[PDB]
Structures are given as C-alpha cells and as structure tokens.
C-alpha cells in the first residue's frame, strides 16, 4: 500500500462520502485529480483509458467488499444522454471568483459530456441482523415503509387530462420521439403514469403530526432518498431503488425493464390493455415491457421499433411515466 492502494482508498472515500451516490463524471474527475500526484504530470492518458482504469478500480473495490458484506453497484439512471449531463449548468468544472462553472478544468481543457450510469454503495445482506441501529427510530421506519407503499401504489392510473407539465423527463422523451421521426404530430399520448405523487397525501399519516412528518421528509430528501420534482411532487431517488432492488421486486411484483436483472420505475409504459397474462387484478405492463429513457432510445432506434407486446403502433406508444 505504498501509492497504489492509496488511490483505492481515496476513490472509496469519495464515492462513500457523497451519501452513497455520486456522478460517474465526478468519479473520473476525482480519479484524475488524485492520480495527478501518483505519476507526476499524468497527461498521456485517454478518456476511454481513464474509464477503463476507473472500472478496474471499482471492480477491485467491489470484490474486496463482497466478502465484507458490501458492494458498489453501478445502476443506470432513468434519465440519460445529455439530459443527465446538463445537471446544473452542465458541469461546474461574475463579480467574485466563486463563479467558475466552466473553469478550473483538470487539464487545460477537457469535457466529459457522456454520462449514463450512477455509482451506488449498498449492502447485499437482506436480513442484516447486525445493522439494526440507525438514526431513524421505528416510527420513521414505519413511515418510510408506508410512504414507499404509496409511491409504488400510485403508479397505477386510469386516465389523465392533456396537461403536459414541463418536467425534465417528458422533455427528453419528446426529444427521443422527434429524433426517431420529426413528425411533431399528436403522438404525445395523454395517459400519465406517476410513481412520484406528492399531493399532501403523505400528510394524512396518523402516528406522526404534520410538522414532524414535514421535518422527517425534509431530512430524508436531504439524505438523497426521496427527490422533489419542480411541480412539488415527491419521488424516490435512484439510491432508494438501488438499495431495495430485491425488496421492491420481492415484496411486490413491479415489472422489470428489457434487462432481465434490472428494475425500472420511470420512462415509458405503453401497457394499453394487452398485458401479459392477467397477473391478479392489474394490467398495463404489469409483469414486463417497460423501458428506461436510454433503453427506450436504444429499442426504438434499433430493429423492432414497434412494441413486442403483441404488436403496437408508435402513436399508441409513448405513455409518459413520471
């Protein structure tokens, strides 16, 4: 552990100091910012080589922590391409020097716009008989369970009006649709699927009062578990599903995306009425046939543009999910 293991220590500390979730471009920037001292200049390196080295380091860390009961999973966000790249005025790296949104680059000038996968720190021991103590007492754990219950329950809707809120997901979906074909016709299907519906419904909780619920939910959002959209609705963040991939998929039957070992909660869910089998009482892609934004772009662009769920047209497709 002269110098090589120090880089692994620093990468683990940086990934684990961001409340367990941080941006792959940030990981690459930090890796460069650290290796700049390991081998002097550190200039004869390519972006793909940097990504490969980062992936190798993360794999080493993952194998090290797997025997310890921890893992660093790489989970793709619901949003992708430049939509996640924009962040807050693209990447941060006026009257005062504090405004350096497009300065202080690691090299003389380098940009890493490509960004599609997030790094998350979780544990695989579902039972977890050891880690029972937590800053959150049983009351707010029950509140968390009830909240998540409502978040996944609200995903089923019968019909919605043609009121297209200008969210960051719908804009990307429309961009993908126009990229596939610039018809700009009435292909924006009206039905809305909402897994993130904060409309004072949570405040109806019984055990905790309104002020306590507000404080607890504000703290949870501050801890990067539930995210608030621009309209004021609450939603579970990427890390929440990343940690509870098995729990959500086990205790409920939420449909999986085109990937056979990944879970999706936002994107496009055509559904219509020709859902696979019958499940128990719900349809609309109850069991499968859901796609992420990036997955949707990949599937539409490539062969089999029409949905494989007994065949469907692009006009009936594009059921926006939020």
């Amino acid at each position: 552990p002269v110098t090589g293991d120090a880089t692994a220590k620093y990468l683990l500390q940086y990934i684990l100091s961001a409340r367990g979730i941080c941006h792959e471009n940030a990981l690459i920037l930090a890796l460069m910012r650290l290796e700049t001292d390991a081998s002097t200049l550190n200039t004869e390196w390519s972006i793909q080589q940097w990504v490969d080295k980062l992936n190798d380091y993360i794999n080493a860390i993952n194998v090290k922590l797997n025997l310890l009961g921890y893992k660093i999973i790489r989970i793709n966000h619901g949003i992708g391409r430049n939509a996640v790249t924009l962040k807050a005025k693209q990447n941060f790296e006026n009257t005062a020097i504090r405004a350096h949104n497009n300065d202080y680059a690691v090299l003389q000038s380098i940009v890493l716009p490509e960004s599609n996968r997030f790094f998350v720190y979780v544990n695989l021991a579902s039972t977890e008989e050891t880690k029972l103590a937590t800053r959150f007492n049983q009351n707010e754990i029950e509140f968390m369970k009830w909240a998540i219950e409502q978040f996944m329950i609200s995903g089923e809707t019968i019909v919605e009006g043609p009121a297209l809120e200008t969210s960051i997901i719908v804009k990307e979906v429309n961009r993908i649709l126009v990229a596939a074909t610039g018809d700009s016709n009435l292909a924006k299907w009206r039905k809305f699927s909402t897994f993130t519906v904060g409309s004072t419904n949570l405040f109806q909780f019984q055990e905790l009062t309104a002020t306590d619920i507000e404080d607890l939910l504000l703290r949870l959002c501050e801890l990067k578990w539930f995210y608030r959209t621009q309209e004021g609705k609450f939603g579970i963040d990427l890390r929440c599903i990343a940690e509870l991939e098995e729990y959500l998929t086990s205790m409920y039957n939420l449909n999986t995306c085109q990937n056979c070992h990944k879970l999706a909660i936002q994107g496009v869910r055509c559904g219509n009425e020709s859902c696979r089998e019958e499940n128990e009482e719900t349809g609309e892609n109850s069991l499968s046939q859901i796609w992420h934004v990036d997955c949707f772009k990949h599937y539409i662009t490539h062969v089999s543009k029409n949905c494989d769920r007994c065949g469907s047209s692009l006009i009936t497709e594009g059921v926006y999910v939020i």
Partner: protein
Amino acid sequence: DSDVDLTEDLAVAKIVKENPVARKMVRYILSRGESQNSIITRNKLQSVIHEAAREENIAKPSFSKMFMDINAILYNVYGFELQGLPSKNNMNAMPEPLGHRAQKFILLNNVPHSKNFDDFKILQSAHTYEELIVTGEYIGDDIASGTSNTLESKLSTDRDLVYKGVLSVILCIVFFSKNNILHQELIKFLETFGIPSDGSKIAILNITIEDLIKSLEKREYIVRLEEKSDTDGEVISYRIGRRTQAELGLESLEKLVQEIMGLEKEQTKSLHDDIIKSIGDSYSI
C-alpha cells in the same frame, strides 16, 4: 514490491474467511460509531464479542487478535483504524496508542491527506452554497423543488455541514482561549456570528444553541467543567474532549489554521511553535 498489495489482500481475505464473526463485528462497529458519531466503550466491545461468539457458536477469539484483525481489514478496505483514546482522568489527575488495552476507541482513516485535493473537496462542497440559500431562502417544501443538490453533489446533507462548521469554529475559539472559556463568554463570542442567543432555534440545524452544545458534549468533542461556586454561581467552562485530542492532531490543526487565514506557505515559519504556545496543555502529550 508490486505484489505486496496483492499478498496483503489475499492475507486479509484468508483472515476474514477464517474469522467469519470479524465481518459482522466490523459492520457493527462501522454502523454504531456513526449512527450517533459517538465514542465506543471497551465494555460494549466485550459484550458484542461474547454475543456474536455465542450466536455463531465459534470459540471466543482473543480480544487482542480480534482488535488487530478489525484494524487490519479496516485499513485494507476502508482505511479506518480504531486508535486508542487516553483515559479522561489523565488530565484530571510520544504516547503510543494502547489499542490492546485502551478503554475507548473511535474510527479514524489513516490515509495521509494530500496537499491540494482537499482544495477540490472544499470547492465542490462550497460552490453551490450561493444557490442553496440565495436571497436567504432554503430548500424543502417551502419551494416547489428539492433537487438543489442536482442528481448528486459533494454538499452531502447541508445539515451536517453546518454542524461541522460550527464545531470547527467552536474548537478554534476554545483552543486559542487558553483552552478555557466560560459558557456565557462562549455564547457572547458566538453571537458575533449571528446565532440567536435568545433560545430561538437556529435556521439550518433546527436545533437550539443549548441543545447543540449538549449534543456536542454528548459526542465528547468538548467536556463541560461544572465548577460550582456560591459567589460566582454555577459557572461552567468548556474544555477540549479527548475525542478531539485524538482526532484533531497538531499538524492537522496547523494546516487548518493556516488555510483559514490564507497565508502563503512561504511564511509558515514561526507558526508551528506559535500554535503550540497558544494551545497550551490541551493535549495529553
């Protein structure tokens, strides 16, 4: 030389495989030492060791061997070490850390701090502050959005950040105040920062000043001196807790104070001894 890392990983893997309870014990330590960010006692360590050994029916490993294994694994993967803590009664009556017999411990990452990466850390942490509370506002239900941290950001919570800043400034005030400051005097100095001294809860932390100080003491950052006296009343003075002594080293404090005032590295002379003079006997060394 290059194979040293690989052989060390193999050795720690063999150790943890031969000691399954070590994984659970490391998990429990890493969880409890941060749930409240407090100190861990020797009695608690012994109790958890016995409980785990009885549950797993494995022969109770020696305490020293378990401590060494935990330290080695933490250094290998997390870089953390459970350095010993000098007894609180030593001051009230180079010291090697008596880990094998220390009464209390606390997690500490031993990776040496670099020279300028922390600059990137602080820049990332503080860049967004201008927009988190622009015009005196704050994030939460009070506004229509709560993604001020973007998809992710180094600011972390912004609740623990303000707490750590308050802790750092309180330590700086106490350290250089002849390592002895009265409670009323401490409140008076803190009032220069705008913290409400009338008992009203502070904005960001949502905690009252008295409750904040009580929590700080409960975390052992500063130890209260209840010097009861009839003439001067119940005057209370705050000392530096052993946690800070074993956590905020002299070199670390020197770097901190140097970079607070932003003086050039060239004029670092006359500062190492000046800081030691100012601090006094705050450390049991």
